[PDB]
Ligand binder design. Structure first.
Ligand SMILES: OC[C@H]1O[C@@](CO)(O[C@H]2O[C@H](CO)[C@@H](O)[C@H](O)[C@H]2O)[C@@H](O)[C@@H]1O
Ligand SMILES: [Fe+2]
Length: 680
């Protein structure tokens, strides 16, 4: 008969129970299938995870094994078996050679799981034989029943599509949190204050005595230590650089002509410029940049008897110094000029007034960063690609394998976010001045006008006129990673798609992109098309769109997420809310007045607890290029992935050499620090 040496490698996850026994039915390339063997698996203790189990077997010969089927075979206290991969060694009677068939899995068996052999196969391929072709249709059909487009009324309007799930637990086990502690990370109760050693500040609504006391929030519980911001935040040079190398580099842009509603006169800023330069000359030469937060106009701030918060709709003007530092030179708190809305300037205003003006500009930026730059443009805008993958692509498809490690965990975290971050009562609601409902409205307002053109990094930075800035470290690093990721995606795609026709006739990728265009990214209530293709007509379109996804799920998220402690650690560097309205007159600002506007003690601790949670990196995390749970079997794919890792290693080396001798190096896009996906 036919001998089969089946080796099962258990993954790093471990469910509850003992009897993890299952049955395995092999299936040959030509349809010849065997009988359900019985794999006995028993877990000694609860902690143990991983390991190998080898089984010798005998049954009907099938030839080349194209796929395997797994079914729960446990009797008492059945435990869901999380399997990394299966290796079946046999011999082809045709030429009596020992051949191994690797089956990359990384799934919980639960009920019944079918796993293809490593080789990736397009539906319009020649290797898509009958047995494969019939299975992949069933797989996708089954998945569509588990992964539907959500209709939660809270989030159906002016937002990207999302998965249908009431809670993280109501999701399929395969896309749940890989750590149970995660589900309870954004709760900010007394115990969370206590974890940071700050429970004595819980419920304390007093002002901070002075600006330096915010350093009290950095206890040994905060392992990153005291942010450099604590030492530099007052410096105009540091201030300017926070709009480039902080957590939100999406707003500032070259200004060739002032908005009519921002009447900055040369007299106000002339001595801040270079000798021999006027405001007009500076603009002609492209030395003037601006941060306009018009989008905050109309967004309501929290207004309750016991909690009132404020925000403005400011404009900031910056100057590109001769040594490549940008500095703030003018600020207007509200869009429309008026008697109570003057232009602030370090040349014409007091030092305390200037500090106040800067704090209000950063506060506006915080609103933008949290809701638009982070949550919307990373978390929510990327989720649709994960949902569409499950609904339209079989696990044998090369694109499914490509995106899998990068979309991992996004559905889980977003489902939690929809309950504990975004809604009223959530984290954002507790720390942002636009909390109380406005945080969602701000996202909706950006979405109504968003298109995927704003995701083309190269062209976005270019049309903003900021891609030439020497000390814009995010830009330099992001552009290296973008081009390296684009190369990788292109290599993979050109392995399986020989030409543009290969892309047209791939019915499965066409279902994928069509589902995104229709349900993933609805135009919104302004009818603004999001510029997601109706179909992929060539390989270049396919590569670009996928480059956007991989880059956003890994690099972009990392840059605007894990840098949050350096940015918000010291609250004054980037205020989350204001408890008093802005000043209406000059000369009124001083230390104590400022302390009355800035967050109180309880509020400040809440932010640190949140930021500390958002920057959680588990020891298991896999960083950019590290594909340990690789689904690719083709040796050509491995070559592409290895070249990828080599290109990343070179970027790491560049960033390190540039960061040499710096006090506060930009380190958030070092490949080894960039997770593969959005899992937090
Ligand atoms: O500061 C220049 C720096 O920017 C890079 C991208 O990181 O190139 C950009 O700026 C150049 C001008 O110096 C442009 O020619 C180029 O088109 C733009 O991408 C780096 O090449 C350069 O070191
Ligand atoms: Fe995040």
């Amino acid at each position: 008969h036919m001998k089969y040496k089946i080796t099962v490698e258990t993954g790093d996850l471990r469910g509850a129970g003992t009897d993890a026994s299952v049955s395995i039915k092999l299936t040959g390339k030509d349809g010849a299938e065997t009988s359900a063997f019985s794999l006995d698996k028993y877990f000694h203790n609860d902690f143990e995870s991983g390991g190998t189990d080898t089984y010798d077997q005998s049954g009907v010969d099938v030839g080349e094994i194209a796929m395997i089927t797994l079914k729960e075979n446990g009797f008492g206290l059945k435990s869901d078996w999380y399997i990394a991969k299966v290796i079946i060694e046999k011999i082809d009677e045709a030429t009596g050679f020992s051949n191994k068939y690797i089956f990359p899995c990384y799934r919980w068996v639960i009920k019944q799981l079918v796993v293809y052999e490593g080789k990736a196969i397009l539906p319009n391929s020649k290797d898509n034989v009958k047995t494969i072709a019939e299975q992949r249709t069933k797989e996708v059909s089954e998945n569509k029943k588990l992964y539907k487009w959500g209709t939660d009324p809270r989030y159906v309007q002016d937002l990207p599509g999302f998965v249908d799930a009431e809670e993280p637990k109501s999701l399929p086990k395969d896309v749940q949190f890989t750590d149970e502690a995660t589900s309870s990370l954004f709760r900010v109760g007394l115990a969370d204050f206590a974890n940071l050693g700050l429970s004595h500040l819980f419920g304390i609504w007093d002002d901070w005595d002075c600006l330096e006391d915010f350093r009290q929030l950095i206890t040994p519980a905060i392992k990153s230590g005291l942010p450099h911001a604590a030492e530099y935040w007052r410096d105009d040079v540091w201030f300017g650089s926070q709009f480039l190398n902080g957590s939100n580099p999406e707003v500032i842009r070259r200004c060739d002509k002032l908005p009519e509603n921002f009447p900055v006169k040369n007299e106000m800023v002339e001595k801040l410029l270079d000798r021999g330069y006027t405001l007009e000359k500076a603009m002609k030469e492209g030395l003037i940049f601006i941060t306009d937060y018009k989008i905050l106009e109309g967004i309501p701030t929290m207004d309750t008897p016991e909690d009132k918060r404020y925000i403005t709709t400011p404009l900031g003007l910056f100057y590109l110094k001769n040594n490549d530092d940008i500095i703030p030179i003018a600020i207007q708190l509200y869009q429309q000029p008026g008697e109570n809305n003057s232009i602030w300037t370090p040349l014409k205003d007091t030092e305390w007034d200037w500090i106040m003006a800067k704090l209000w500009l950063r506060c506006a930026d915080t609103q933008y960063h949290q809701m638009i730059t982070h949550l919307l443009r990373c978390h929510l805008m990327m989720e649709p690609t994960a949902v569409s993958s499950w609904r339209n692509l079989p696990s044998v498809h090369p694109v499914w394998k490509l995106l899998y490690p990068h979309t991992k965990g996004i559905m889980a975290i977003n489902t939690l976010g929809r309950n504990d971050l975004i809604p009223t009562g959530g984290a954002a609601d507790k720390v942002l001045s636009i909390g109380g409902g406005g945080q969602v409205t701000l996202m909706q307002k950006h979405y109504r006008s968003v298109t995927f053109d704003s995701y083309d990094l190269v062209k976005d930075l270019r049309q903003r006129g900021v891609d030439g800035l020497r000390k814009f470290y995010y830009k330099d690093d992001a552009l290296l990673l973008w081009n390296v990721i684009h190369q990788f995606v292109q290599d993979i795609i050109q392995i399986y798609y020989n030409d543009d026709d290969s892309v047209k006739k791939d019915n499965e990728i066409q279902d994928w992109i069509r589902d995104l265009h229709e349900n993933g990214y609805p135009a919104g209530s302004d009818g603004t098309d999001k510029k997601v293709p109706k179909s992929f007509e060539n390989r270049e379109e396919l590569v670009h769109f996928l480059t956007v996804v991989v880059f956003t799920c890994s690099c972009q998220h990392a840059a605007v997420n894990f840098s949050q402690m350096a940015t918000y650690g010291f609250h004054p560097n980037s205020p989350t809310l204001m408890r008093q309205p802005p000043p209406t007159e000059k000369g009124k600002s001083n230390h104590k007045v400022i302390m009355a506007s800035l967050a109180n003690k309880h509020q400040a601790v809440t932010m640190v607890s949140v930021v500390n949670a958002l920057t959680t990196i588990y020891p298991t995390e896999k960083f950019l290029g590290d594909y340990a749970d690789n689904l690719f079997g083709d040796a050509a794919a491995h070559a592409a992935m290895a070249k990828f890792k080599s290109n990343l290693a070179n970027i790491t080396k560049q960033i390190t050499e540039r960061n040499q001798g710096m006090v506060s190096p930009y380190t958030w896009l070092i490949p080894g620090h960039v997770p593969n996906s959005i899992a937090i």
